[PDB]
Design a protein around this nucleic acid. Sequence first.
RNA 1: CGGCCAACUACGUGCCAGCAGCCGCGGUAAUACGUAGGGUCCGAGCGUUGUCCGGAAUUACUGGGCGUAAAGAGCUCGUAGGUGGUUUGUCGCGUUGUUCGUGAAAACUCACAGCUUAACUGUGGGCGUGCGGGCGAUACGGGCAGACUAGAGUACUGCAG
RNA 2: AGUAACUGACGCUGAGGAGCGAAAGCGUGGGGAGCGAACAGGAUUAGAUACCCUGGUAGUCCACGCCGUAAACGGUGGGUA
RNA 3: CUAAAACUCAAAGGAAUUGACGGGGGCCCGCACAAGCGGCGGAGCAUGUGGAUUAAUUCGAUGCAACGCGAAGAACCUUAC
Lengths: 200, 122, 198, 32, 210
Amino acid sequence: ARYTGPATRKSRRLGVDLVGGDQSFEKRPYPPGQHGRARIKESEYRQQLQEKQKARFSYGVMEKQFRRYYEEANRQPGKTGDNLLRILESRLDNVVYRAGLARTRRMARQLVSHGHFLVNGVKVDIPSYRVSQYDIIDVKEKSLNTLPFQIARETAGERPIPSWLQVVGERQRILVHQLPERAQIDVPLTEQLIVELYSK
Amino acid sequence: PTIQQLVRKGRRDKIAKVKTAALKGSPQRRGVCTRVYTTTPKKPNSALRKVARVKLTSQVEVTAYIPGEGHNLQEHSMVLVRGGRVKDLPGVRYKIIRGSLDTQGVKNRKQARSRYGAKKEK
Amino acid sequence: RGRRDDRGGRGRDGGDKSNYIERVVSINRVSKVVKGGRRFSFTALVIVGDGKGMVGVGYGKAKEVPAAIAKGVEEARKNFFRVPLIGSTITHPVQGEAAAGVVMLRPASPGTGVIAGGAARAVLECAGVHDILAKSLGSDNAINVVHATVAALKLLQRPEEVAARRGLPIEDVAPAGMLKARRESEALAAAAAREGSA
Amino acid sequence: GSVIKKRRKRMSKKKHRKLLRRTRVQRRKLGK
Amino acid sequence: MGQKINPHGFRLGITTEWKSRWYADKQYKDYVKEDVAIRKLLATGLERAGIADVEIERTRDRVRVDIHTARPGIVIGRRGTEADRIRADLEKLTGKQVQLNILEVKNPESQAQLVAQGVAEQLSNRVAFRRAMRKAIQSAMRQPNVKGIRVQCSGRLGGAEMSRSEFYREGRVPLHTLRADIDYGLYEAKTTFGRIGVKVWIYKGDIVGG
RNA sequence: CGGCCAACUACGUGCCAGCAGCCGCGGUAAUACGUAGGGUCCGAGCGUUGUCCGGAAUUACUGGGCGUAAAGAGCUCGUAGGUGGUUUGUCGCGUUGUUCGUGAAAACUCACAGCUUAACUGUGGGCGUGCGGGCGAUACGGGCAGACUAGAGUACUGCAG
RNA sequence: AGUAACUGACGCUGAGGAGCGAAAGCGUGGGGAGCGAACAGGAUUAGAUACCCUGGUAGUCCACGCCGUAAACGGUGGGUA
RNA sequence: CUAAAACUCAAAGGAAUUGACGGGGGCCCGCACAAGCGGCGGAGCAUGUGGAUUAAUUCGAUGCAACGCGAAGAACCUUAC
Ligand SMILES: [Mg+2]
Ligand SMILES: [Mg+2]
Ligand SMILES: [Mg+2]
Ligand SMILES: [Mg+2]
Ligand SMILES: [Mg+2]
Ligand SMILES: [Mg+2]
Ligand SMILES: [Mg+2]
Ligand SMILES: [Mg+2]
Ligand SMILES: [Mg+2]
Ligand SMILES: [Mg+2]
Ligand SMILES: [Mg+2]
């Protein structure tokens, strides 16, 4: 299932901006609902769960998928937090959203689900597609000569392209060199709390 | 302590401590109902709990409590007994599921929606 | 605990140095019987320490929660405690035994995360440990668990310290992996120092 | 410790001995 | 809470003064009636503005009121909109004129009644009553020609159900000593749950005052 | 949607009707019952029932005690057993190192590859905690052949009861 | 304890088992002063089948035998540096 | 002596700390006990209260610490029945 409710509600409830570009969050920093001014008791478990909820609502991933990603991270030899962040950022939806071909995570997910890309010359309609090293993400002409893709490729001035992603020209052929790292991702929220929570 | 004693005899489990006499571990069972009456809880809580003696098909006789507000079952009815726990009732370790074979759901219920056999209103 | 993040119209409100990571374990009401009626009190179990590893526990006693918390903070600041560390983890596995609290602590690799009970996790987060393991085996309490953690930390010893005590140089006491971890931690500390000074 | 458990054991043993004194004749008639 | 007698009510003719100093044969009734009427009329206004004492004296068929305001500017706004308005209200409610004359206090923190009004307003403003009392005690002990203070906020503190009476004191507050010149303040605060009592004592100094 | 444990506003029920896993909540002003909304968890699944484990160090060999929480037999002799002072030679049953065969296929995991991703599947290893044969080692546990007194028992002279 | 001579590991514990084992009680034949279970009465109490008083059968004693029970408490097993 | 099962309880237990108490102790006070004076309780009057009537006997205080208390003023009024 895919989330359909308002994202600003969750952003205000958690206290951090999940979509990045939004004014409702900064206009109403208090949690939504009839009780947004009540003092909430500080709880380690509460903060640990809020971190995971922020990550989930920002990356657009289900709970079972997040649990599987955490399990794979813990199974990997590296560190749990960085491995989880890497396996979550390696998704095709977030990759194409950070490459500049999409404005919002929801739009990137919708586009990658509608089948508007060509991974190594093969079609794909799964946002959970985990890219690998030296992978190429192309775009078909039908989805290239359209309006949304043109606007997304001409408005490439929101954020700079990271070190592990690159645009090889006007074709918007996304190229990846290696897997992302902590310094290359630079996620606002940390991962130690989420790891300690999932390691209960 | 005394590894020799441990090798000789000792270090055994205490007991299995069977929770309920489920008769081969049957979560939900049925049977005949009789004497649908009311019982009084302990002194810390004064009320009237509607209970009934149920003779299950496993050749056993227990006392089951009907959860909810209005019970529809009566003498010689088909109910679905399950394993429960009622602290206020001393000696009751079984409950009845509403809306399984002959019981009817509670009226004006739109919050629980899972227990008491509450259906979805249109 | 309430109405603390205010802005008074006075000169100073309490802004100073010593921004240690203060953490409360638990607060319970204590009653005393007298000739007519009962008198209530508040006991606070505070832990104050710097992110470097210097920790200190306190036990404040008053008739108000803020006063008890302040007394505990002052007691912790007065009675400090030093703890050895290798980068971000404990030195060696230990098992501290308080009156009834038996807290066993074990090291862990970077990126694992601290795991312990309430008071144990509180004191460890207040300390400079981030990736270790700990378990309190019984006594179902908080003050005893804190004292057991303090005893476990006291039972620790630095590598160079134990080497000088046994009369041997380096590379003859610490394993190769532990020595490499210590060298990496020292390099990281030197890099932090030079990047903060320059 | 206290004497609560000791008093309980004493009462139980006294009741058991009273029951035995009452049923002595019947037990003897059955075991003769 | 306790059976301690009001120091002002006890020394009304020894150390403290009287708020109503007049005499009349068969007219004292109407005099005190007009006094309490003026008091009830000015209650809300002078409470929102800050009031310490209202000394009313009676003259040859006229009145002489002296109100001790703490924050001048709220009750005395534009000349002809607030002060004259309340004056005309009092005049049309009573059967005579009113030559209202306000007198400003020297220090709001030195007056017991003003401290009680302030602490009650703070408590009603949804703040910590403990911190409010502490700051009030600090303000009243910041050398306002004082030597002791004792503040108490009884009733349903913190909107709870138990009648908690926090006994807070500082300095020297003797009640059995006559040569005290202690000022007292009794206030009743209204909340969304019920009523609250505020009892204040300010021991200024050991002045005889004979 | 009271604390365990992520989340509150109002109306009606005020020892009643009910809620509930433990603490346990209502006797007119229930964040603990029904109803209206608001918040939280999940999402084609959500809560409940029955079963096994962790927490419970709650059969403690790794991981407890036996004076006052459960516990030294009322005290002695003794069978089988457990165990045992120093030291020389010897066998090497235990132990240790090495090597050959097995420990099937299958399963878990590391790496790669395919079904659009994943579930799923195939390939090269670890594992398959052990076992069967040969050789090496002798400090230690074990057996045999020796020696000695600090333990053990007896001898002679006194001693309290 | 002293001499320290003698064999030189024969040292310690001990599942079952065997022995001893406070008081109380039973059989046999005696004795029984005092005390003293039960039993009778006197006295208080609303009620005393008890605490108090007056007589007293078994018991307390001897030899042959039995059950193995005590707060058998140092509530703490034996042995070793 | 060997020795359980069903059922039940959310405890049962150990140490110490502060109040209450001992017909426990030790150190001391109050017309408190002892000696004296004047009484209540015995009869009439005055009310208040309990209890019963009642068209209403408005309402309460339930010892010490309520009961010549609220009545420091009851034909209408007071009075709320
Ligand atoms: Mg013994
Ligand atoms: Mg040997
Ligand atoms: Mg295999
Ligand atoms: Mg034996
Ligand atoms: Mg005898
Ligand atoms: Mg005899
Ligand atoms: Mg006698
Ligand atoms: Mg009389
Ligand atoms: Mg009353
Ligand atoms: Mg009187
Ligand atoms: Mg009339």
